Write a protein that binds this DNA or RNA. Structure first.
Lengths: 83, 81
DNA sequence: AAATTTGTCCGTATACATTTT
DNA sequence: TAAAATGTATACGGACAAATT
């Protein structure tokens, strides 16, 4: 019964994607609407966590996934960037 | 190296929790209180008796399997190598 | 069967290490 | 130089997945 995110139990079609996946969708949206152009910086990990209201590890999980599929690349001490 | 309780003239340190668990388990083995192919206490038992999280237990045990002191069988249990 | 037990996923918190800037 | 930003380590919690017993 894949946990995902659940607001409530009863009836229907059930509930939301995990937090990190929601974050993934948002970031990937920024890239694919071109609000963030190739080689440009995404708002940082700290910033991201303050705006999304999630842990740094949730942010890092989303970003890491997006790096693995090659949409982002990150530079230690530098920042994170559009691929 | 990682832990403390902060006081003057120096700083008081202790091993991280998982390290303490490691020492305990490995001492059980090296004193022969547990013999090859015998199972150690379950991760659940260990967390309840040591008062730490299942991940602290799993971390210690993981380090001890990497050394070949232990081996675990999923659904089976954990054993002295 | 179905309960135990170990394995992995998801989420949170704090501290410190490593590089850039 | 330090500050900032990413990386890894140490904890904790809950829920689910997989294989044994």
């Amino acid at each position: 019964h894949h946990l995902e995110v659940l607001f409530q139990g009863p009836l229907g079609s059930e509930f939301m994607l995990p937090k990190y996946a929601q974050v993934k969708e948002e970031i990937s949206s920024w890239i694919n609407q071109g609000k963030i152009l190739p080689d440009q910086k995404i708002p940082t990990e700290n910033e991201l966590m303050q705006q999304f209201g999630v842990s740094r590890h949730t942010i890092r999980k989303a970003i890491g996934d997006l790096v693995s599929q090659g949409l982002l690349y990150s530079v230690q001490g530098g920042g994170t960037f559009v691929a």
